[PDB]
C-alpha cells in the first residue's frame, strides 16, 4: 500500500463529460458476459 495512495492521487477523473442506474450497469455487465 506504499504507492496505492499515489495511484489514488494520480488518476485523472476531474472532467466527467459523460452526461442512469446501477441495475442498468448489471444488465450491461450480463450482456457483455
Amino acid at each position: 500500500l506504499i504507492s496505492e495512495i499515489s495511484s489514488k492521487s494520480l488518476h485523472n477523473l476531474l472532467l466527467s463529460e459523460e452526461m442512469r442506474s446501477p441495475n442498468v450497469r448489471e444488465v450491461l455487465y450480463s450482456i457483455l458476459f
Partner: peptide, 30 residues
C-alpha cells in the same frame, strides 16, 4: 477514495493499466 464500483469501462481500463504499469516499472529494473 471514491470506491471502485462507480467508474466506467475506460476508467476501469485506466485503473488496471495503472496497476500493470506499476508492476512493469517495478519489473524493468531487473
Amino acid at each position: 477514495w471514491i470506491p471502485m464500483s462507480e467508474l466506467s469501462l475506460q476508467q476501469q481500463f485506466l485503473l488496471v493499466t495503472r496497476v500493470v504499469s506499476r508492476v512493469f516499472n517495478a519489473l524493468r529494473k531487473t
